[PDB]
Amino acid sequence: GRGAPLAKVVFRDPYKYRLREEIFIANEGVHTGQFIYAGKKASLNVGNVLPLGSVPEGTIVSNVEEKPGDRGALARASGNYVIIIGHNPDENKTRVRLPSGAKKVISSDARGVIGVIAGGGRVDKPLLKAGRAFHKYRLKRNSWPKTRGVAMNPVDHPHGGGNHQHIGKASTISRGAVSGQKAGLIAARRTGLLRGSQKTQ
Amino acid sequence: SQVFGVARIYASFNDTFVHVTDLSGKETIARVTGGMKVKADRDESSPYAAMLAAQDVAAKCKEVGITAVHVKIRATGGTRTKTPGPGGQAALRALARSGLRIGRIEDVTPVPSDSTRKKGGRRGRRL
Amino acid sequence: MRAKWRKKRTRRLKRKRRKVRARSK
Amino acid sequence: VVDPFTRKEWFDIKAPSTFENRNVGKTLVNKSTGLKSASDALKGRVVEVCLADLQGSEDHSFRKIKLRVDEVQGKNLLTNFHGMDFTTDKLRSMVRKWQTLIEANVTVKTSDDYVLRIFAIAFTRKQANQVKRHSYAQSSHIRAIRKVISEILTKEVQGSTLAQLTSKLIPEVINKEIENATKDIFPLQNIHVRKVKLLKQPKFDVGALMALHG
Amino acid sequence: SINQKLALVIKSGKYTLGYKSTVKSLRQGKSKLIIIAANTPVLRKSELEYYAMLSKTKVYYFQGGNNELGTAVGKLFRVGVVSILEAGDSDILTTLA
């Protein structure tokens, strides 16, 4: 139920004689046998893990931390990555752009892994039949298929009932709504078909 | 003898700028435009106004400190009409005659290695 | 009429007959 | 009821070494207050005086010079090198029809690791007796001259800093060596270094700066 | 070129192709050059290199892959190493390489 493959990477325990194996999301191009380096003072190659402070701008990294140590939070879905778009060294913040478009700033100590996450392209190919979605959500969570609330009776849902199917009122629901009410377009600040280049500036 | 500011006279059509700055540029001093010293829109570039504005500007230049100044006259340009406007002439004219000093003046009309498609489309602004 | 606006006249004209015939294939 | 004229702290601009008048100009600031000070915020601006105005002689009216403010010490702010340009009028005059143009450039690092790009311009010339009304080099000609200009420009930079390069460009020696190696290929006229830009400086280092001063 | 050189060697000299049989050649100190394909794994690379230094034999690090090495010696298969046994008229042994 994950898009991108994992990568099992074993390390020596600096303190005990033993191998300690970690689980990574595999960046594209990484491979069995490959040597992976992790540390401030380490080298800028696909597969390694370096603190956003130590890589030049335009570096491309995956599985990055929001706070240093949290062992990776941003950009883990197949195909996603982040780009360092600036640094402010007196404060050691570093500024990234996340897959969404949003640009956060985080500790230059927050770590990331050089590259992009693998199995990208996954969503370009049609699911084609209900069975393929079926097995898709089967290994995720019981969220499929989805009855339209407008096919329900009133007991069931804001949209239920009436002698033809129809929402009956604006399906744009305030943030200040209350559970039992938030179905539809929640807190929608605009609505309708999007025309013209999206792309945040 | 003097103290050296920078003139920078932007003379496009429908308006003329004059405003002196510190030789470095970061710090300005005084401005005023043709649209400032007459009222009728149509007459916002014309010399007789570019005078009356280059007049006010000559004042402040001395009513603060700057004795002298080299000019860098400029037109619209970019992907546009590269020619000096009507009232940059009147400016230069009526600012050497005012009471300041001139010396070493060039043109900073932006002229690209050409590109960025001109406005008006293939058939031009036709009428 | 301009030659080409007439070329465009009968382009349309054909699309319509092209349609109306399909109606009955 | 203010008029920022009653307030603006004032200042005078000095130039650096290899020139005529180190005294250059004056400037406006804004009183050095605790928090937001006349100091650190600006100063480091840059000024564009013609080096003829900066070297006396007038065989120099073109060739623009950019002086950036690097340091400051009470009513005295020194300036150093930041680049050179050309007067737009001189340029649009060397470029006459009926003759082949040639331009050439290279990015490069001096000693004091200031990195920069210098440009070169040159045009063909007719020679005294040339009947044909235009004179054009022959492309294979152009690549040659360009190459050499590049071999000659790369040498001169990475002599000790712009400091010597500054010293180098002002007498425009580079121009003649160009013409020197060149006339083995094809005539030519004008031949200048035209433009030079600055794009990478090393660390501040109050030392080397305060060696062009005293 | 270098291929051009190698070309000469093929159509006039003596050689051998492949990992086992250039070691026969290194052990018998019969090799004059061994040429090493880019993507040949380091272990093999490192091993030949050791073999070669013990036998005082220079080693060319052919910067193409073993697919194209095989084509450089004009075979429709692929070689990870070549051993020059004699350079027929080719100067590879005493040119740049």
Add this chain to the structure above:
Amino acid sequence: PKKRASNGRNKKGRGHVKPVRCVNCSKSIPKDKAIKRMAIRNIVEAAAVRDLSEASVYPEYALPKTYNKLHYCVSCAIHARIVRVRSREDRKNRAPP
């Protein structure tokens, strides 16, 4: 019929030359058919030259022109600038003044 050997204007061994934009209406028009004119004129003007040198520093200074190539579109070239319209013979004549 055909009313010019140059057809529009002056391309005989090509096929295509890039267009340029009219310095007036911004109309596109091939660079060869284009109608051009160097606009070299001082930075000053008529009487401004006298009240220049006076209030300037330096002796005499220099005086520079502006230099900007002008491209019209025929219609614009005709409507105002160089054009008149020439007789059937006076047409042929390409000598400028």
Add this chain to the structure above:
Amino acid sequence: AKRTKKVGITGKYGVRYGSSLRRQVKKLEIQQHARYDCSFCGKKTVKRGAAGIWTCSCCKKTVAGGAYTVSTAAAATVRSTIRRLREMVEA
């Protein structure tokens, strides 16, 4: 002896789902089943097995890849971009 005219592998779906989708699947499907050149051992023996996973028959290395193709447009451009940036920090 040309068996189909344009469905190809996509003939398994017969008439269903609409040409336009059958088309798009057929693309990524071809991608997704092909034998690829192995960077490492030079034989063409890389086949898929679950999205992102590209492992070499003989020779036995596995590589993270795209979901239906070994190397992804971006993956590659990223590769070169890092390489560029890497080399910027030792010169």
Add this chain to the structure above:
RNA sequence: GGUGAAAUUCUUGGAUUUAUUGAAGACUAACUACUGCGAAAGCAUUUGCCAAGGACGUUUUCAUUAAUCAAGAACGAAAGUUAGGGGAUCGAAGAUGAUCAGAUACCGUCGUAGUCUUAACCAUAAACUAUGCCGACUAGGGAUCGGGUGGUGUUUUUUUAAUGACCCACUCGGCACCUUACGAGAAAUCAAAGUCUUUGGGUUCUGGGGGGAGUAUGGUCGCAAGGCUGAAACUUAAAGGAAUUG
């Protein structure tokens, strides 16, 4: 700000202007020309790489291997279509400001698709020189582009050369211009559109009064838009071309 003049529009959010950096994508100004190259579309920053090519030189090689071509095929501006990416600019659509009797426009603002690129399509332009290709012959001139041969030419100085650039005569092969008329033509004009009632070097292709109409129909190609092939009935005395006078 924008204009013939305005207005819609932007302005405590310091607009416009200035100044120091930075980003993105387009484009290649000036030099650019009666100048180059390509089968045609078309091609203008540097550098490396990659294979290609005409002209020229040639006391080299082969020896009729060639000319031109239904079918068939390669490329094919712009827009347009499919799937990514890109999306600075300009900007079909649309919405607006104005003008107007009206104004679905022209002018002004916003600006979707587009514009760029990859992988596939489409196959059309006044895709023009409105002018098939190969061969022969017929007439004057000065320029120029590329190659070449000649010269006790000019300039570069060093010590004189070597060179390089320039000069002059010739020669092939280019893009073109000029003057002619042997000649041609309905003329305009044309060194081919000439060497034709004194009508034959070879070869391909198209037209046969105007509309109807590139319409209908079939076939075929295309995702589509559309491409190619392509009639009739019926109507009609003209339509048309060059030149002249008004």
